[PDB]
C-alpha cells in the first residue's frame, strides 16, 4: 500500500530541511564576528592620533 | 508510489527557484552601471567652472 511508501520519504524530507537549516545559522554566526569587529576597529582608528606641540634645535 | 511524484516536482522546484535568482542579478548589473556613471558626472560638474579675468573696451 501507499502508507508504507510515505512513511519512508518522510523521514527523508525531514532529513534534508536540517541540512539546509545548518548552512543558514553556521554562516549567520561566521558573518556576526567579522562585523562586530569591523566596528569597533574602525571606532578605534578614526579617533586616535598624534600631535606635534613644539620643536627646538641646538 | 510516492516516489515517483516526490521527483518529478522536485526538478519543478530547482527550475523556478533559478528564475528567480536570474532577476535579481541582472537588476542588479542594471542598477551598477547607473550609480557609477551618476557619481562620476556630478563630481565633474561641480568642480568644472569659468571665471572672467577683465574687460577692455574701445
Same mark, same amino acid.
Given at each position: 500500500e501507499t502508507g508504507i511508501g510515505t512513511l519512508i520519504i518522510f523521514i527523508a524530507m525531514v532529513l534534508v530541511a536540517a541540512v539546509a537549516a545548518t548552512v543558514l545559522i553556521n554562516t549567520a *554566526? =561566521?558573518?556576526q564576528q567579522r562585523a562586530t569587529s +569591523? *566596528? =569597533?576597529q574602525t571606532t578605534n582608528?578614526?579617533? +586616535? *592620533?598624534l600631535i606635534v606641540q613644539?620643536?627646538?634645535g641646538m
Open positions: *554566526g =561566521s558573518l +569591523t *566596528g =569597533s582608528q578614526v579617533s +586616535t *592620533g613644539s620643536i627646538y
